[PDB]
Amino acid sequence: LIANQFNSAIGKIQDSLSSTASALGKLQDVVNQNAQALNTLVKQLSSNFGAISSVLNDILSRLDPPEAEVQIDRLITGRLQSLQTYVTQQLIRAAEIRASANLAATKMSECVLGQSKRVDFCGKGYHLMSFPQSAPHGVVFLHVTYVPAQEKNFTTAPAICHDGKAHFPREGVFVSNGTHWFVTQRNFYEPQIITTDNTFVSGNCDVVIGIVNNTVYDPLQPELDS
Amino acid sequence: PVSMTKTSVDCTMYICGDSTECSNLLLQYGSFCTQLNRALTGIAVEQDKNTQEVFAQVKQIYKTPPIKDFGGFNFSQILPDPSKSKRSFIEDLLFNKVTKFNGLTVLPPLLTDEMIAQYTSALLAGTITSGWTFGAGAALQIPFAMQMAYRFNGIGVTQNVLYENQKLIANQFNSAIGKIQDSLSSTASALGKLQDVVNQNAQALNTLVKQLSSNFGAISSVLNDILSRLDPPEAEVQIDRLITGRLQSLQTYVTQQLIRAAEIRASANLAATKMSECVLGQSKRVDFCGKGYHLMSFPQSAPHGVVFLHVT
Amino acid sequence: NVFQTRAGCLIGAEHVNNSYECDIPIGAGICASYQTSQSIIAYTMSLGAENSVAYSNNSIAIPTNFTISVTTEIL
Ligand SMILES: *[C@@H]1O[C@H](CO)[C@@H](O[C@@H]2O[C@H](CO)[C@@H](O[C@@H]3O[C@H](CO)[C@@H](O)[C@H](O)[C@@H]3O)[C@H](O)[C@H]2NC(C)=O)[C@H](O)[C@H]1NC(C)=O
Ligand SMILES: *[C@@H]1O[C@H](CO)[C@@H](O[C@@H]2O[C@H](CO)[C@@H](O[C@@H]3O[C@H](CO)[C@@H](O)[C@H](O)[C@@H]3O)[C@H](O)[C@H]2NC(C)=O)[C@H](O)[C@H]1NC(C)=O
Ligand SMILES: *[C@@H]1O[C@H](CO[C@@H]2O[C@@H](C)[C@@H](O)[C@@H](O)[C@@H]2O)[C@@H](O[C@@H]2O[C@H](CO)[C@@H](O)[C@H](O)[C@H]2NC(C)=O)[C@H](O)[C@H]1NC(C)=O
Ligand SMILES: *[C@@H]1O[C@H](CO)[C@@H](O[C@@H]2O[C@H](CO)[C@@H](O)[C@H](O)[C@H]2NC(C)=O)[C@H](O)[C@H]1NC(C)=O
Ligand SMILES: *[C@@H]1O[C@H](CO)[C@@H](O)[C@H](O)[C@H]1NC(C)=O
């Protein structure tokens, strides 16, 4: 059953990617931002900044150096300011991309090379593993996670008394279908008889709040009787 | 801190307010306005993205049951009460401890404070009634005493330690919440982090505006005054000086905003991580969730930011 | 036909009493979307279907089945 669910889920990923493309907005946004930065940088070349003509050779020809100097100096100031603005945009955007790259490195080291227990760090749900896939200027993870599905409203109790002593479940929780009592692991209903092995004793009936009487079976009574 | 104030600045009405000659001069500098406007809009949207990532992590909007059988713990100082702004008490203490002519529009945040309060009440009700499970899938209710049993057993302390000391732990937790209430209500230098962001942006705006009253080497800092006092064959030069000056001031402000917004986004991603790992579950990263072994946490909104109560 | 929001003056969208997920953000919590002959409506976005967990002092809900989702994360 797990195999079939995992295969079908991979298939749904295949389809989701193949049909809609707004899932890859993150990479496309970086590419478009840099393309527009370059296009603005270039289109700044066609501006006068208060000079005569946006072409350099044209100013060198149309005038004399005693004024081509001033016109040029204006163009140089303008283009230099535009260039610094572009480089500052690039510095900031590169700091941000380095942030996402360190984050991806962490996510691959903790989420592929091992199984993590950081909630929602590796896809919504309990984390099982992940597989990376390349993508143009970036990475794409497939967080294979485990999600509990369909529950039941059981009745519980923090401990049970059998012989005056309190009994707490070793690794599980005490549930009851209204008729009997069982101890079951927290994440998957799999009831078990409450032996003296599933539980461990402590104190007496007095102190815990909400305890319920019951009979904790003991595996030694059969052999001891026989 | 989670978000700045979404500010937008019309380049033109700033640099060349109501002077056609000035606008037509500015057009010679090219696409600087388009660039600055696009940058400030990028920031102004990243803010709403930040708040979205920090708070909107719950799929539904849970609600505590009306009765309050929580094994003896008392959450009335953090759960909402309908008697106000449907916020809670400590959210109020937080909201009280924190205290236009030139295109300086201040857009409103997409999530209004009531909706932020509803998100945080949802996360709080989920953590109270369902443990961490509401962050892994469908919320599964479980008596609070047992949830603290699991939280203990998670840090290497068997359950009977909790069950035998339930009343003592309840009293300690209630009294600690009370001390938080007092600590916030009396001193206010605990909220220095949010107030510092607000003041930094206020001073940035005030410097931007007070740059309007500078000559940059021109005749008079007023535009119409230069247009009147002289002729275009010299008003052009005087203006061009004013435009260069105001444009430089505007770029400096927008660069300050870009950097400060990168920093606030750093703190917002950190808050998102801290809420996903520290509320929606119990962490084992030392000192990541308050000094000590970590038991759980409850978030509380605050003007442009979040405030956790790491119960450890 | 002419709505007045805490963001500004919306022109050309009906103001509904309903509440759906935010499709196009506006501000101050208002979100607009194109829906049913149809038109553009501007509502106050809803945060999700409210839900009251049947909490008690002795009721626990345990799963019986599981599903293996496979999500994607792009960086
Ligand atoms: C736990 O959940 C899984 C969910 O996949 C359950 O398995 C699925 O159960 C449904 C309902 O019976 C199956 O659908 C039916 O499949 C049969 C196969 O011949 C078909 O005749 C029906 O028309 C319908 O499609 C589905 O196949 C099945 N999935 C797998 C992979 O077996 C599973 O039963 C649940 N566990 C428990 C204990 O309920
Ligand atoms: C573990 O530490 C806790 C710390 O709270 C201990 O509980 C506290 O113990 C002090 C000392 O006895 C109590 O103070 C006294 O309370 C009585 C109550 O009537 C009063 O008559 C005295 O004047 C004094 O105030 C305090 O109440 C108590 N706190 C609680 C919540 O019970 C606890 O005893 C320690 N455990 C062990 C095993 O020592
Ligand atoms: C849980 O059981 C205790 C005691 O259990 C009794 O003694 C056991 C050895 C076994 O024979 C059980 O069937 C008995 O019920 C109960 O404590 C008693 O409560 C009664 C009041 O009904 C009181 O008269 C007795 O003195 C108490 N003590 C004993 C030793 O009987 C307790 O009430 C039970 N609780 C629940 C929720 O069932
Ligand atoms: C939980 O704590 C609140 C206070 O945070 C308690 O409310 C107090 O109740 C007493 C008795 O009714 C009053 O004297 C106080 O004035 C109340 N204070 C406030 C701030 O309301 C409440 O009793 C505690 N217990 C429960 C079960 O809610
Ligand atoms: C739960 O609350 C009901 C309400 O009266 C009470 O009768 C019962 O004893 C309580 N049980 C526990 C374990 O708190």
PDB file of N, CA, C and O in Angstrom, chain C residues 19-46:
ATOM      1  N   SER C  19     -17.535  35.707   1.758  1.00  0.00           N
ATOM      2  CA  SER C  19     -16.125  35.687   2.107  1.00  0.00           C
ATOM      3  C   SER C  19     -15.445  34.487   1.480  1.00  0.00           C
ATOM      4  O   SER C  19     -15.760  33.347   1.824  1.00  0.00           O
ATOM      5  N   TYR C  20     -14.506  34.719   0.574  1.00  0.00           N
ATOM      6  CA  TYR C  20     -13.780  33.634  -0.057  1.00  0.00           C
ATOM      7  C   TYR C  20     -12.293  33.880   0.120  1.00  0.00           C
ATOM      8  O   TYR C  20     -11.874  34.939   0.587  1.00  0.00           O
ATOM      9  N   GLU C  21     -11.491  32.888  -0.247  1.00  0.00           N
ATOM     10  CA  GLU C  21     -10.051  33.033  -0.160  1.00  0.00           C
ATOM     11  C   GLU C  21      -9.599  34.211  -1.010  1.00  0.00           C
ATOM     12  O   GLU C  21     -10.203  34.546  -2.024  1.00  0.00           O
ATOM     13  N   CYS C  22      -8.528  34.857  -0.577  1.00  0.00           N
ATOM     14  CA  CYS C  22      -8.080  36.071  -1.240  1.00  0.00           C
ATOM     15  C   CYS C  22      -7.518  35.724  -2.605  1.00  0.00           C
ATOM     16  O   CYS C  22      -6.517  35.012  -2.708  1.00  0.00           O
ATOM     17  N   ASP C  23      -8.156  36.237  -3.652  1.00  0.00           N
ATOM     18  CA  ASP C  23      -7.720  36.006  -5.019  1.00  0.00           C
ATOM     19  C   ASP C  23      -6.809  37.123  -5.508  1.00  0.00           C
ATOM     20  O   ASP C  23      -5.677  36.870  -5.922  1.00  0.00           O
ATOM     21  N   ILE C  24      -7.283  38.359  -5.461  1.00  0.00           N
ATOM     22  CA  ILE C  24      -6.452  39.505  -5.799  1.00  0.00           C
ATOM     23  C   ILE C  24      -6.401  40.427  -4.592  1.00  0.00           C
ATOM     24  O   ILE C  24      -7.437  40.954  -4.172  1.00  0.00           O
ATOM     25  N   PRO C  25      -5.233  40.658  -4.008  1.00  0.00           N
ATOM     26  CA  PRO C  25      -5.160  41.471  -2.799  1.00  0.00           C
ATOM     27  C   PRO C  25      -5.435  42.924  -3.132  1.00  0.00           C
ATOM     28  O   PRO C  25      -5.124  43.387  -4.226  1.00  0.00           O
ATOM     29  N   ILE C  26      -6.026  43.638  -2.185  1.00  0.00           N
ATOM     30  CA  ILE C  26      -6.300  45.054  -2.358  1.00  0.00           C
ATOM     31  C   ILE C  26      -5.655  45.840  -1.236  1.00  0.00           C
ATOM     32  O   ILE C  26      -4.821  46.717  -1.472  1.00  0.00           O
ATOM     33  N   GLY C  27      -6.029  45.530  -0.016  1.00  0.00           N
ATOM     34  CA  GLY C  27      -5.533  46.248   1.135  1.00  0.00           C
ATOM     35  C   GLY C  27      -6.550  46.209   2.245  1.00  0.00           C
ATOM     36  O   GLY C  27      -7.729  45.965   2.044  1.00  0.00           O
ATOM     37  N   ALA C  28      -6.067  46.416   3.458  1.00  0.00           N
ATOM     38  CA  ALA C  28      -6.918  46.480   4.632  1.00  0.00           C
ATOM     39  C   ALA C  28      -7.807  45.264   4.765  1.00  0.00           C
ATOM     40  O   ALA C  28      -8.812  45.303   5.466  1.00  0.00           O
ATOM     41  N   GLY C  29      -7.471  44.180   4.097  1.00  0.00           N
ATOM     42  CA  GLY C  29      -8.227  42.961   4.232  1.00  0.00           C
ATOM     43  C   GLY C  29      -9.232  42.706   3.142  1.00  0.00           C
ATOM     44  O   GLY C  29      -9.857  41.646   3.146  1.00  0.00           O
ATOM     45  N   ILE C  30      -9.399  43.620   2.210  1.00  0.00           N
ATOM     46  CA  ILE C  30     -10.339  43.450   1.113  1.00  0.00           C
ATOM     47  C   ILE C  30      -9.635  42.727  -0.018  1.00  0.00           C
ATOM     48  O   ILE C  30      -8.482  43.010  -0.338  1.00  0.00           O
ATOM     49  N   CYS C  31     -10.332  41.789  -0.640  1.00  0.00           N
ATOM     50  CA  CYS C  31      -9.784  41.080  -1.784  1.00  0.00           C
ATOM     51  C   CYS C  31     -10.851  40.984  -2.853  1.00  0.00           C
ATOM     52  O   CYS C  31     -12.018  40.731  -2.543  1.00  0.00           O
ATOM     53  N   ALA C  32     -10.456  41.182  -4.103  1.00  0.00           N
ATOM     54  CA  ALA C  32     -11.377  41.189  -5.223  1.00  0.00           C
ATOM     55  C   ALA C  32     -11.139  39.981  -6.111  1.00  0.00           C
ATOM     56  O   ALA C  32     -10.028  39.459  -6.184  1.00  0.00           O
ATOM     57  N   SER C  33     -12.192  39.548  -6.795  1.00  0.00           N
ATOM     58  CA  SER C  33     -12.110  38.385  -7.664  1.00  0.00           C
ATOM     59  C   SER C  33     -13.263  38.394  -8.650  1.00  0.00           C
ATOM     60  O   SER C  33     -14.311  38.985  -8.400  1.00  0.00           O
ATOM     61  N   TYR C  34     -13.066  37.711  -9.768  1.00  0.00           N
ATOM     62  CA  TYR C  34     -14.019  37.713 -10.872  1.00  0.00           C
ATOM     63  C   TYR C  34     -14.898  36.479 -10.771  1.00  0.00           C
ATOM     64  O   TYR C  34     -14.445  35.367 -11.045  1.00  0.00           O
ATOM     65  N   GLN C  35     -16.157  36.675 -10.397  1.00  0.00           N
ATOM     66  CA  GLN C  35     -17.061  35.555 -10.184  1.00  0.00           C
ATOM     67  C   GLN C  35     -18.473  35.937 -10.586  1.00  0.00           C
ATOM     68  O   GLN C  35     -18.775  37.100 -10.853  1.00  0.00           O
ATOM     69  N   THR C  36     -19.338  34.931 -10.617  1.00  0.00           N
ATOM     70  CA  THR C  36     -20.744  35.135 -10.936  1.00  0.00           C
ATOM     71  C   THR C  36     -21.436  35.916  -9.824  1.00  0.00           C
ATOM     72  O   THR C  36     -21.700  35.379  -8.749  1.00  0.00           O
ATOM     73  N   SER C  37     -22.640  37.491 -17.360  1.00  0.00           N
ATOM     74  CA  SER C  37     -23.440  37.412 -16.142  1.00  0.00           C
ATOM     75  C   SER C  37     -22.568  37.580 -14.909  1.00  0.00           C
ATOM     76  O   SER C  37     -23.043  37.985 -13.852  1.00  0.00           O
ATOM     77  N   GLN C  38     -21.289  37.247 -15.049  1.00  0.00           N
ATOM     78  CA  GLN C  38     -20.356  37.399 -13.949  1.00  0.00           C
ATOM     79  C   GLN C  38     -19.802  38.819 -13.935  1.00  0.00           C
ATOM     80  O   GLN C  38     -20.010  39.610 -14.856  1.00  0.00           O
ATOM     81  N   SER C  39     -19.078  39.140 -12.879  1.00  0.00           N
ATOM     82  CA  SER C  39     -18.550  40.482 -12.684  1.00  0.00           C
ATOM     83  C   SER C  39     -17.352  40.374 -11.756  1.00  0.00           C
ATOM     84  O   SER C  39     -16.798  39.286 -11.556  1.00  0.00           O
ATOM     85  N   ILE C  40     -16.942  41.508 -11.201  1.00  0.00           N
ATOM     86  CA  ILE C  40     -15.828  41.583 -10.266  1.00  0.00           C
ATOM     87  C   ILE C  40     -16.383  41.975  -8.910  1.00  0.00           C
ATOM     88  O   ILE C  40     -17.018  43.024  -8.777  1.00  0.00           O
ATOM     89  N   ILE C  41     -16.143  41.140  -7.912  1.00  0.00           N
ATOM     90  CA  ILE C  41     -16.643  41.365  -6.567  1.00  0.00           C
ATOM     91  C   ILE C  41     -15.475  41.655  -5.649  1.00  0.00           C
ATOM     92  O   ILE C  41     -14.347  41.225  -5.896  1.00  0.00           O
ATOM     93  N   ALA C  42     -15.751  42.393  -4.583  1.00  0.00           N
ATOM     94  CA  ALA C  42     -14.742  42.762  -3.602  1.00  0.00           C
ATOM     95  C   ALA C  42     -15.278  42.434  -2.222  1.00  0.00           C
ATOM     96  O   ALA C  42     -16.220  43.076  -1.757  1.00  0.00           O
ATOM     97  N   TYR C  43     -14.675  41.453  -1.566  1.00  0.00           N
ATOM     98  CA  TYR C  43     -15.170  40.954  -0.300  1.00  0.00           C
ATOM     99  C   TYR C  43     -14.112  41.165   0.764  1.00  0.00           C
ATOM    100  O   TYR C  43     -13.022  41.664   0.490  1.00  0.00           O
ATOM    101  N   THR C  44     -14.428  40.760   1.986  1.00  0.00           N
ATOM    102  CA  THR C  44     -13.473  40.768   3.083  1.00  0.00           C
ATOM    103  C   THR C  44     -12.956  39.359   3.285  1.00  0.00           C
ATOM    104  O   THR C  44     -13.667  38.511   3.824  1.00  0.00           O
ATOM    105  N   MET C  45     -11.714  39.125   2.881  1.00  0.00           N
ATOM    106  CA  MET C  45     -11.204  37.775   2.721  1.00  0.00           C
ATOM    107  C   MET C  45     -11.417  36.956   3.976  1.00  0.00           C
ATOM    108  O   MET C  45     -11.377  37.467   5.093  1.00  0.00           O
ATOM    109  N   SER C  46     -11.675  35.680   3.783  1.00  0.00           N
ATOM    110  CA  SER C  46     -11.809  34.771   4.903  1.00  0.00           C
ATOM    111  C   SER C  46     -10.525  33.984   5.070  1.00  0.00           C
ATOM    112  O   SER C  46      -9.818  33.687   4.109  1.00  0.00           O
TER     113      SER C  46
END
